[PDB]
Coordinates of C-alpha atoms (C1' of nucleotides) in Angstrom, one line a residue:
Chain A
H4 CA 10.4 -20.2 -57.9
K5 CA 8.4 -20.9 -60.9
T6 CA 8.6 -22.9 -64.5
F7 CA 8.1 -21.6 -68.0
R8 CA 5.1 -23.1 -68.2
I9 CA 3.4 -22.0 -64.9
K10 CA 4.6 -18.5 -65.1
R11 CA 2.9 -18.4 -68.8
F12 CA -0.5 -20.3 -67.2
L13 CA -0.3 -17.4 -64.8
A14 CA 0.5 -14.6 -67.7
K15 CA -2.7 -15.9 -69.7
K16 CA -4.7 -16.1 -66.4
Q17 CA -3.9 -12.2 -65.9
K18 CA -4.7 -11.0 -69.2
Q19 CA -8.2 -12.3 -68.8
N20 CA -8.8 -10.1 -65.4
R21 CA -10.2 -7.1 -67.3
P22 CA -13.5 -5.6 -67.5
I23 CA -15.2 -6.0 -70.9
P24 CA -14.5 -2.8 -73.4
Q25 CA -17.2 -0.4 -72.9
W26 CA -18.1 -0.1 -76.9
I27 CA -19.3 -3.8 -76.8
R28 CA -22.4 -2.3 -74.7
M29 CA -23.5 -0.6 -78.3
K30 CA -23.7 -3.6 -80.5
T31 CA -26.6 -4.6 -82.4
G32 CA -26.9 -7.8 -80.7
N33 CA -25.4 -7.5 -77.3
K34 CA -26.5 -9.3 -74.3
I35 CA -23.7 -9.1 -72.4
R36 CA -23.4 -6.4 -69.5
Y37 CA -20.0 -7.1 -67.6
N38 CA -17.8 -9.7 -67.2
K40 CA -15.9 -14.4 -65.4
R41 CA -13.6 -11.7 -63.5
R42 CA -11.3 -13.6 -60.7
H43 CA -10.1 -12.2 -57.5
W44 CA -6.6 -13.8 -56.2
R45 CA -8.3 -14.0 -52.6
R46 CA -11.8 -15.1 -53.3
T47 CA -11.3 -17.7 -56.1
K48 CA -8.3 -20.0 -56.2
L49 CA -6.6 -21.0 -59.5
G50 CA -6.7 -24.8 -60.5
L51 CA -3.4 -25.3 -59.0
Chain B
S2 CA -2.5 15.5 -47.0
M3 CA -1.3 12.1 -46.7
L4 CA 2.5 11.8 -46.6
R5 CA 3.1 8.1 -46.6
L6 CA 5.2 8.2 -49.8
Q7 CA 7.2 11.0 -48.6
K8 CA 8.0 9.4 -45.0
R9 CA 8.7 6.4 -46.5
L10 CA 11.5 7.7 -49.1
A11 CA 12.8 9.9 -46.3
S12 CA 13.5 6.6 -44.2
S13 CA 15.2 4.9 -47.0
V14 CA 17.0 7.8 -48.0
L15 CA 18.2 8.7 -44.0
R16 CA 19.0 5.0 -43.4
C17 CA 16.8 5.7 -40.3
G18 CA 13.3 4.3 -39.4
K21 CA 13.1 9.0 -36.6
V22 CA 11.9 11.0 -39.6
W23 CA 10.5 14.4 -39.1
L24 CA 8.4 16.2 -41.7
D25 CA 7.8 20.0 -40.9
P26 CA 4.4 20.3 -40.0
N27 CA 4.3 23.9 -41.9
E28 CA 5.7 22.7 -44.8
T29 CA 3.3 20.3 -45.7
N30 CA 2.6 21.7 -49.1
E31 CA 6.5 22.1 -49.9
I32 CA 6.3 18.3 -49.0
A33 CA 3.8 16.3 -50.6
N34 CA 5.1 17.3 -54.1
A35 CA 8.6 15.1 -53.5
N36 CA 7.1 11.7 -55.3
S37 CA 10.8 11.2 -56.2
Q40 CA 13.5 15.6 -54.1
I41 CA 13.3 14.1 -50.8
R42 CA 17.3 14.5 -50.6
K43 CA 16.9 18.1 -51.9
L44 CA 14.1 18.6 -49.0
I45 CA 16.5 17.0 -46.3
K46 CA 19.3 19.6 -47.3
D47 CA 17.6 22.7 -46.5
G48 CA 16.1 21.3 -43.5
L49 CA 12.2 20.8 -44.1
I50 CA 13.0 16.8 -43.4
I51 CA 15.2 15.8 -40.6
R52 CA 16.2 12.8 -38.9
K53 CA 15.5 12.8 -35.1
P54 CA 17.7 11.7 -32.6
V55 CA 17.7 8.3 -31.0
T56 CA 15.9 8.2 -27.6
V57 CA 18.0 8.3 -24.6
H58 CA 19.0 4.9 -23.0
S59 CA 21.7 5.8 -20.3
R60 CA 24.1 3.2 -18.7
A61 CA 24.8 5.8 -15.6
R62 CA 22.8 3.8 -13.5
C63 CA 24.4 0.4 -14.6
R64 CA 27.9 1.9 -14.2
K65 CA 27.2 3.1 -10.7
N66 CA 25.9 -0.1 -9.4
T67 CA 28.8 -1.8 -11.0
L68 CA 31.3 0.2 -9.2
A69 CA 28.9 -0.5 -6.1
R70 CA 29.5 -3.9 -6.9
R71 CA 33.3 -3.6 -7.3
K72 CA 33.5 -2.3 -3.8
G73 CA 31.2 -5.3 -2.8
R74 CA 27.5 -4.6 -2.5
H75 CA 24.7 -6.1 -3.7
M76 CA 26.2 -9.3 -3.3
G77 CA 25.3 -10.9 0.1
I78 CA 23.0 -13.8 0.7
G79 CA 20.0 -12.2 0.0
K80 CA 21.0 -11.0 -3.8
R81 CA 22.2 -14.8 -5.2
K82 CA 19.9 -16.6 -7.2
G83 CA 22.2 -19.2 -8.6
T84 CA 24.5 -22.0 -6.9
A85 CA 27.8 -21.1 -6.3
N86 CA 29.0 -23.7 -9.1
Chain C
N18 CA -16.9 42.8 -23.4
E19 CA -16.6 39.3 -24.4
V20 CA -13.1 39.0 -25.0
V21 CA -12.4 38.7 -21.3
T22 CA -9.1 36.3 -20.2
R23 CA -9.3 35.0 -17.0
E24 CA -7.2 32.5 -14.6
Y25 CA -8.9 29.6 -12.7
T26 CA -8.1 26.5 -10.4
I27 CA -9.5 23.3 -11.8
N28 CA -9.6 20.5 -9.3
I29 CA -9.1 17.7 -11.2
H30 CA -9.0 15.2 -8.3
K31 CA -12.5 15.6 -7.3
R32 CA -13.6 15.5 -11.1
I33 CA -12.1 12.3 -11.8
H34 CA -13.2 10.0 -8.6
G35 CA -13.4 6.4 -8.8
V36 CA -13.0 6.4 -12.1
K39 CA -7.4 3.8 -18.5
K40 CA -9.5 6.6 -18.6
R41 CA -8.3 9.1 -15.7
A42 CA -6.5 11.5 -18.2
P43 CA -9.3 11.5 -21.0
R44 CA -11.6 12.0 -18.5
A45 CA -9.7 14.9 -17.2
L46 CA -9.6 16.6 -20.6
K47 CA -13.4 16.1 -21.1
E48 CA -13.8 17.6 -17.6
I49 CA -11.5 20.3 -18.5
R50 CA -13.2 21.1 -21.7
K51 CA -16.7 20.6 -19.7
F52 CA -15.1 23.5 -17.0
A53 CA -14.2 25.4 -19.6
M54 CA -17.7 25.2 -21.3
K55 CA -19.5 26.1 -18.3
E56 CA -17.3 28.9 -17.4
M57 CA -17.5 30.8 -20.6
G58 CA -20.5 29.7 -22.2
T59 CA -18.9 29.0 -25.5
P60 CA -19.3 25.4 -26.9
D61 CA -16.0 26.0 -28.6
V62 CA -13.2 24.8 -26.4
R63 CA -9.6 24.5 -27.7
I64 CA -6.9 23.0 -25.4
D65 CA -3.4 24.2 -25.8
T66 CA -1.4 21.2 -26.6
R67 CA 1.2 22.1 -23.5
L68 CA -2.1 21.8 -21.4
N69 CA -2.7 18.6 -23.1
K70 CA 0.9 17.2 -22.0
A71 CA 0.5 18.5 -18.7
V72 CA -2.6 16.7 -17.9
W73 CA -0.8 13.5 -19.4
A74 CA 2.4 14.4 -17.6
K75 CA 2.4 11.5 -15.2
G76 CA 0.5 8.6 -17.7
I77 CA -3.0 7.9 -18.1
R78 CA -3.5 6.8 -14.8
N79 CA -2.1 9.7 -12.0
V80 CA -3.4 12.7 -13.1
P81 CA -2.3 15.7 -11.2
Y82 CA -4.7 16.8 -8.5
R83 CA -5.4 20.3 -9.2
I84 CA -4.2 22.5 -12.8
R85 CA -4.0 26.1 -13.0
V86 CA -5.3 27.2 -16.3
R87 CA -6.2 30.3 -18.4
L88 CA -9.7 30.8 -20.5
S89 CA -9.2 33.4 -22.9
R90 CA -12.4 34.2 -24.8
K91 CA -11.5 35.2 -28.5
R92 CA -13.2 36.5 -31.1
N93 CA -13.2 33.6 -33.6
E94 CA -13.0 36.0 -36.7
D95 CA -11.2 33.7 -38.8
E96 CA -13.7 30.8 -39.1
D97 CA -17.6 31.8 -40.4
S98 CA -18.3 28.7 -38.2
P99 CA -22.0 29.5 -36.4
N100 CA -20.3 29.9 -33.1
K101 CA -18.7 33.5 -33.1
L102 CA -16.6 33.1 -29.8
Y103 CA -14.1 30.2 -28.7
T104 CA -12.2 29.8 -25.2
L105 CA -8.8 28.9 -25.6
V106 CA -7.4 27.1 -22.6
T107 CA -3.8 27.8 -21.7
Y108 CA -1.5 26.1 -19.2
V109 CA -0.3 27.9 -16.4
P110 CA 2.4 26.2 -14.3
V111 CA 2.6 27.3 -10.4
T112 CA 4.8 26.5 -7.5
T113 CA 2.0 26.1 -5.5
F114 CA -1.8 26.2 -5.6
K115 CA -2.0 27.6 -1.8
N116 CA -4.4 30.4 -1.4
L117 CA -4.9 30.8 -5.4
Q118 CA -8.1 32.6 -6.4
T119 CA -9.8 33.2 -9.6
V120 CA -8.3 36.2 -11.1
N121 CA -9.0 38.2 -14.1
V122 CA -6.1 39.1 -16.7
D123 CA -5.6 42.4 -17.9
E124 CA -4.5 42.2 -21.5
Chain D
rA1 C1' -42.2 5.0 -69.0
rG2 C1' -49.1 3.7 -64.4
rA3 C1' -43.1 0.3 -70.9
rG4 C1' -37.1 4.3 -68.0
rG5 C1' -31.5 -0.1 -69.8
rC6 C1' -37.4 -2.8 -68.2
rG7 C1' -44.0 -7.1 -71.8
rU8 C1' -48.0 -8.4 -68.0
rG9 C1' -47.6 -8.4 -63.8
rA10 C1' -50.5 -12.4 -59.2
rA11 C1' -49.9 -14.1 -53.7
rA12 C1' -47.1 -14.6 -49.2
rC13 C1' -45.5 -10.0 -46.6
rC14 C1' -45.0 -4.1 -45.4
rG15 C1' -45.9 1.3 -45.8
rU16 C1' -49.9 4.5 -46.2
rU17 C1' -54.9 6.7 -46.7
Chain E
rU1 C1' -55.6 -2.6 -66.9
rG2 C1' -53.7 -5.4 -70.5
rG3 C1' -51.9 -5.3 -75.3
rA4 C1' -52.4 -10.3 -79.4
rG5 C1' -54.7 -13.5 -79.5
rC6 C1' -59.1 -16.9 -78.1
rC7 C1' -64.1 -19.3 -77.2
rG8 C1' -68.7 -22.1 -77.9
rC9 C1' -71.3 -27.3 -79.5
rC10 C1' -70.4 -32.7 -81.8
rG11 C1' -66.3 -36.3 -81.4
rC12 C1' -61.3 -37.6 -80.4
rA13 C1' -56.7 -37.6 -77.0
rG14 C1' -53.9 -37.1 -72.1
rG15 C1' -47.7 -36.0 -68.6
rU16 C1' -55.8 -33.4 -67.2
rG17 C1' -57.7 -31.0 -61.2
rC18 C1' -53.5 -31.0 -54.2
rA19 C1' -53.1 -28.5 -47.9
rG20 C1' -50.5 -32.0 -46.3
rA21 C1' -46.0 -36.1 -48.4
rU22 C1' -39.4 -34.2 -41.6
rC23 C1' -42.7 -33.2 -50.5
rU24 C1' -39.1 -30.3 -54.6
rU25 C1' -37.8 -25.3 -56.4
rG26 C1' -38.4 -19.9 -55.6
rG27 C1' -40.1 -16.3 -52.7
rU28 C1' -41.4 -14.1 -47.9
rG29 C1' -42.9 -13.5 -42.5
rG30 C1' -42.9 -13.3 -36.9
rU31 C1' -39.2 -13.8 -33.9
rA32 C1' -36.4 -8.5 -34.3
rG33 C1' -34.1 -3.4 -34.5
rU34 C1' -33.6 -8.9 -31.3
rA35 C1' -28.5 -12.2 -29.8
rG36 C1' -25.0 -9.5 -30.9
rC37 C1' -20.5 -6.2 -32.7
rA38 C1' -16.6 -8.5 -24.7
rA39 C1' -9.3 -13.2 -25.7
rA40 C1' -4.3 -10.3 -26.3
rU41 C1' -3.3 -3.1 -20.7
rA42 C1' -4.6 2.8 -24.3
rU43 C1' -5.5 6.3 -25.8
rU44 C1' -4.9 12.5 -25.9
rC45 C1' -4.2 17.7 -27.9
rA46 C1' -3.8 20.4 -31.8
rA47 C1' -3.4 21.5 -37.1
rA48 C1' -3.9 19.9 -42.7
rC49 C1' -7.1 18.3 -46.9
rG50 C1' -11.9 17.4 -47.3
rA51 C1' -19.3 18.3 -48.4
rG52 C1' -18.6 15.4 -44.7
rC53 C1' -11.0 6.0 -37.2
rU54 C1' -6.9 9.7 -43.0
rU55 C1' -2.2 12.5 -42.8
rU56 C1' 1.4 15.7 -39.9
rG57 C1' 3.4 17.4 -35.2
rA58 C1' 3.6 16.5 -30.0
rA59 C1' 2.2 13.5 -25.9
rG60 C1' 1.1 8.7 -23.2
rG61 C1' 1.6 3.6 -23.9
rC62 C1' 2.6 -1.3 -25.7
rC63 C1' 6.0 -6.0 -28.7
rG64 C1' 10.5 -6.2 -25.9
rA65 C1' 12.5 -17.3 -28.7
rG66 C1' 9.3 -9.4 -31.4
rU67 C1' 4.0 -7.1 -33.0
rG68 C1' 11.5 -6.0 -36.0
rG69 C1' 14.7 -7.5 -40.3
rA70 C1' 15.0 -11.4 -44.5
rG71 C1' 13.6 -16.4 -47.1
rA72 C1' 11.6 -21.8 -48.1
rA73 C1' 6.3 -23.7 -49.6
rG74 C1' 2.1 -21.9 -51.1
rG75 C1' -0.3 -17.7 -53.5
rG76 C1' -0.2 -15.3 -58.5
rU77 C1' 0.0 -9.4 -59.6
rU78 C1' -1.8 -9.1 -53.8
Chain F
rC1 C1' 10.2 -8.1 -15.7
rC2 C1' 11.6 -2.9 -17.3
rU3 C1' 14.1 -0.4 -21.5
rC4 C1' 17.2 0.7 -26.9
rU5 C1' 17.3 0.1 -32.6
rG6 C1' 13.0 -1.1 -35.5
rG7 C1' 7.8 -1.7 -35.1
rC8 C1' 2.6 -0.8 -33.9
rA9 C1' -2.4 1.3 -32.6
rU10 C1' -5.0 -2.3 -29.1
rG11 C1' -6.8 -6.4 -33.2
rU12 C1' -15.1 -6.1 -37.0
rU13 C1' -16.9 0.4 -33.8
rG14 C1' -17.8 4.1 -30.6
rG15 C1' -20.2 6.9 -26.1
rA16 C1' -22.9 6.9 -21.0
rA17 C1' -23.4 4.5 -16.5
rC18 C1' -21.6 1.3 -13.1
rA19 C1' -28.1 -3.0 -11.3
rA20 C1' -28.7 -8.2 -10.8
rU21 C1' -26.8 -12.8 -13.0
rG22 C1' -22.1 -14.2 -15.0
rU23 C1' -16.5 -14.6 -16.7
rA24 C1' -11.2 -13.4 -15.2
rG25 C1' -8.7 -11.7 -10.6
rG26 C1' -7.9 -9.6 -5.1
rU27 C1' -9.0 -9.6 0.1
rA28 C1' -11.5 -11.5 4.7
rA29 C1' -12.4 -11.5 11.9
rG30 C1' -12.8 -16.4 14.7
rG31 C1' -12.7 -21.5 13.5
rG32 C1' -10.0 -24.6 10.3
rA33 C1' -12.7 -29.8 5.6
rA34 C1' -17.5 -29.5 10.8
rG35 C1' -18.2 -28.6 2.8
rU36 C1' -17.9 -32.6 -0.8
rC37 C1' -18.3 -39.4 -3.6
rG38 C1' -13.5 -37.2 -3.3
rG39 C1' -9.3 -31.2 0.2
rC40 C1' -12.5 -30.5 -6.3
rA41 C1' -9.6 -25.4 -6.5
rA42 C1' -6.9 -22.4 -4.3
rG43 C1' -3.9 -21.8 -0.5
rC44 C1' 0.5 -23.2 2.0
rC45 C1' 6.0 -24.7 0.8
rG46 C1' 9.5 -22.3 -2.9
rG47 C1' 15.5 -18.9 -4.8
rA48 C1' 20.4 -19.3 -2.7
rU49 C1' 24.3 -20.1 1.9
rC50 C1' 25.3 -22.5 6.6
rC51 C1' 23.7 -27.1 9.3
rG52 C1' 20.9 -31.3 9.3
rU53 C1' 18.6 -35.4 7.2
rA54 C1' 15.2 -41.6 8.7
rA55 C1' 12.5 -46.2 7.6
rC56 C1' 14.0 -48.9 3.6
rU57 C1' 17.1 -50.6 -0.8
rU58 C1' 18.9 -53.8 -6.4
rC59 C1' 23.9 -50.4 -2.0
rG60 C1' 23.0 -47.1 -7.3
rG61 C1' 19.2 -44.4 -4.1
rG62 C1' 15.7 -42.6 -1.2
rA63 C1' 17.6 -37.1 -0.9
rU64 C1' 15.9 -30.5 -1.9
rA65 C1' 13.8 -36.8 2.4
rA66 C1' 12.0 -34.8 7.3
rG67 C1' 13.6 -30.2 10.4
rG68 C1' 16.5 -25.1 11.7
rA69 C1' 18.9 -20.7 10.7
rU70 C1' 20.2 -16.7 7.5
rU71 C1' 19.6 -13.1 3.8
rG72 C1' 18.5 -5.2 3.4
rG73 C1' 21.6 -0.8 2.9
rC74 C1' 26.3 1.2 4.3
rU75 C1' 31.5 1.3 5.9
rC76 C1' 35.8 -1.6 5.9
rU77 C1' 39.5 -6.1 6.5
rA78 C1' 41.6 -10.6 4.5
rA79 C1' 42.3 -13.5 0.6
rG80 C1' 42.3 -15.1 -4.1
rG81 C1' 46.5 -12.5 -10.8
rG82 C1' 50.2 -10.6 -14.9
rC83 C1' 54.6 -7.7 -16.6
rU84 C1' 59.5 -5.1 -14.2
rG85 C1' 65.6 -5.5 -11.1
rA86 C1' 61.0 -20.4 1.4
rG87 C1' 62.3 -13.0 -0.8
rC88 C1' 62.2 -7.1 -1.5
rA89 C1' 60.5 -2.4 -4.2
rG90 C1' 56.5 -0.1 -9.5
rC91 C1' 52.9 -0.3 -13.5
rC92 C1' 48.6 -3.0 -15.6
rG93 C1' 44.2 -5.6 -14.2
rA94 C1' 38.7 -9.0 -13.8
rC95 C1' 35.5 -10.3 -10.7
rU96 C1' 34.8 -13.4 -6.5
rU97 C1' 34.5 -15.6 -1.7
rA98 C1' 35.0 -15.3 3.4
rG99 C1' 35.0 -12.2 8.4
rA100 C1' 33.3 -7.9 10.7
rA101 C1' 31.4 -2.9 12.4
rC102 C1' 27.6 0.7 12.0
rU103 C1' 22.1 1.1 10.5
rG104 C1' 16.6 1.0 9.4
rG105 C1' 9.2 1.2 13.0
rU106 C1' 12.4 -6.8 11.9
rG107 C1' 12.5 -5.0 7.4
rC108 C1' 15.2 -7.6 3.2
rG109 C1' 14.9 -14.4 -2.6
rG110 C1' 10.6 -7.2 -0.7
rA111 C1' 8.3 -6.9 -7.4
rC112 C1' 9.4 -11.1 -11.1
rC113 C1' 11.4 -16.1 -10.5
rA114 C1' 10.1 -20.2 -7.9
rG115 C1' 9.6 -28.3 -4.9
rG116 C1' 3.5 -28.3 0.5
rG117 C1' 5.0 -32.7 3.5
rG118 C1' 4.9 -37.6 6.0
rA119 C1' 2.9 -42.8 7.3
rA120 C1' 0.7 -46.7 4.2
rU121 C1' -2.3 -50.0 0.7
rC122 C1' -3.4 -51.7 -4.7
rC123 C1' -1.1 -52.0 -9.8
rG124 C1' 2.4 -51.7 -13.5
rA125 C1' 9.8 -52.9 -12.8
rC126 C1' 11.8 -48.2 -14.8
rU127 C1' 12.2 -44.5 -19.7
rG128 C1' 8.9 -45.1 -23.9
rU129 C1' 3.5 -45.6 -26.5
rU130 C1' -1.8 -45.2 -26.7
rU131 C1' -7.8 -44.4 -28.9
rA132 C1' -6.6 -36.2 -33.9
rA133 C1' -12.4 -35.1 -31.5
rU134 C1' -15.2 -37.8 -24.4
rU135 C1' -11.1 -42.9 -21.4
rA136 C1' -2.9 -41.4 -20.8
rA137 C1' -4.6 -46.1 -17.7
rA138 C1' -3.4 -51.1 -14.0
rA139 C1' -3.6 -51.0 -21.3
rC140 C1' 0.5 -51.7 -25.2
rA141 C1' 5.9 -51.4 -25.8
Chain G
rA1 C1' -9.9 7.7 -1.8
rU2 C1' -5.1 4.1 -6.2
rG3 C1' -4.9 8.4 0.6
rU4 C1' 0.1 8.3 2.8
rG5 C1' 4.3 6.0 4.3
rC6 C1' 8.0 1.3 3.3
rU7 C1' 10.2 -1.4 -0.8
rU8 C1' 12.6 -4.7 -5.6
rG9 C1' 13.4 -4.6 -10.8
rG10 C1' 13.8 -0.9 -14.8
rC11 C1' 13.5 4.1 -16.8
rU12 C1' 13.7 9.8 -17.1
rG13 C1' 21.9 12.0 -16.7
rA14 C1' 22.0 12.7 -11.1
rG15 C1' 18.6 14.8 -7.6
rG16 C1' 14.5 17.1 -5.6
rA17 C1' 9.8 14.7 -8.4
rG18 C1' 8.2 10.8 -10.6
rC19 C1' 6.7 6.8 -14.0
rC20 C1' 6.3 1.3 -16.2
rA21 C1' 6.0 -4.1 -14.0
rA22 C1' -3.0 -5.9 -17.5
rU23 C1' -4.0 -3.1 -9.1
rG24 C1' 4.6 -4.6 -8.7
rG25 C1' 4.4 -6.0 -3.4
rG26 C1' 3.6 -4.5 1.5
rG27 C1' 1.8 -1.5 6.2
rC28 C1' -2.0 1.7 8.3
rG29 C1' -6.0 3.8 6.3
rA30 C1' -11.5 8.4 5.1
rA31 C1' -16.1 7.6 3.1
rG32 C1' -19.5 4.2 1.5
rC33 C1' -20.8 -0.7 1.9
rU34 C1' -21.6 -4.8 5.2
rA35 C1' -21.2 -9.2 9.6
rC36 C1' -26.0 -12.9 15.0
rC37 C1' -18.7 -11.0 13.5
rA38 C1' -25.4 -5.7 16.1
rU39 C1' -24.2 -3.9 24.1
rC40 C1' -31.6 -2.0 17.8
rU41 C1' -37.1 -3.5 17.3
rG42 C1' -41.0 -7.4 17.0
rU43 C1' -47.9 -6.3 19.3
rG44 C1' -53.9 -6.5 20.8

RNA sequence: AGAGGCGUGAAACCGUU
RNA sequence: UGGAGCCGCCGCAGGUGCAGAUCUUGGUGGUAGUAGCAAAUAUUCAAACGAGCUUUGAAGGCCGAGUGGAGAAGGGUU
RNA sequence: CCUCUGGCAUGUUGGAACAAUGUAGGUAAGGGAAGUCGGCAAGCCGGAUCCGUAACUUCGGGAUAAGGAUUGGCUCUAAGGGCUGAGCAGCCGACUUAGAACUGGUGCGGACCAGGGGAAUCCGACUGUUUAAUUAAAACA
RNA sequence: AUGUGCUUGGCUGAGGAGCCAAUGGGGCGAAGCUACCAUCUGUG
């Protein structure tokens, strides 16, 4: 039992839980080395 | 190697818990990721029989108690009523 | 010759005395007995023998067992040991007057 | 690279000679 | 060894000198390869893959108002 | 408590040994609370059937008071129903109760389950509630 | 000695044989350990 808004929030939170693309490490001024990753057990969503 | 998927599918198809995978056909199994029915038909995977729980002892004592046995003062735990 | 096969009686009763571990101890002591008798550290227990040892649960192991030790050539594997000892179960009606005998094969 | 995904590189502490 | 700035004298100025504050932050010891990894009976044999408690088969066991089968709340892809 | 369907691998590991001290269980001759602030804990009783049951009492109780006997296995007897043409013949049918004989190295609620009892004093009538995480009480109601 | 009898409930179709019930319960009990619960010893 979910609402549409909760489900959309969950979908957005799911689409953000991926590693960075590797080619971004090759850019000219890149300071990132890895991804704000979230684990369902380690950290809980704001609900 | 690992046959968890094959055993789970066999349990679901056979409607049992009781699944017997042939220990010698471990390579003809493990490439049946969907085919489990085909392996059932040729006997590579079988349904084992139910472990026996006989009622012969129960029937024999029930007959003995019909004749009237094990029903004395020393065998009663409840009141008459 | 090192491909001998011989037949022994193991007093399981005295090898497990004063010891939930009696059947595991029986298996360990049978393996130790086979290693002592045949010298080969590679000892393989037949599943029928393991079933015989566990015939009355972990707690009440039979007092004596009639076993067969066969020293095999190990031509299959390239393991450092070039001989192994297969241990087989020999059911017997009685243990009285049973000696260690070589079996011809 | 006695600069090796990191300038120099102290002390506490440790290894070795 | 280090690789890009720095110091003397005459004055001016100051957030200007630490061993303590059960000081703040960061790092590191002895303790010490020590306490410990002891609630719920229990594991064994063989084979397979593999560089090297997993899987399969066979035994022996356990749960027996369940250690079974399904949901609600919660979680949010597990 | 044991099993079948279903499930699991002993609950963050394994191996060897079996010292002390410990935690959790079991037993102990003779004595039997002499221990201790105090019988703390733990051990006696315990199920059924048949007998028996006091003081006191608000006559409801107390009360399973207290106290005694029995209980296994096996082979019988008797009684207890439904359909067929003050009582006779068949077919079907589920479990009890009581009374006996025989029989065991007196053992038999054989494990499990399962009230120790009595004579009094104080307080609160009773049932109920209460300081989550030191006080369940005579406190509160 | 889980040694050998007996026995409850369950289980292996029955028996012979056994197993489970965190030692099922109970009788007797080798060894070992152990008691002023020793018919052992304790001094110039």
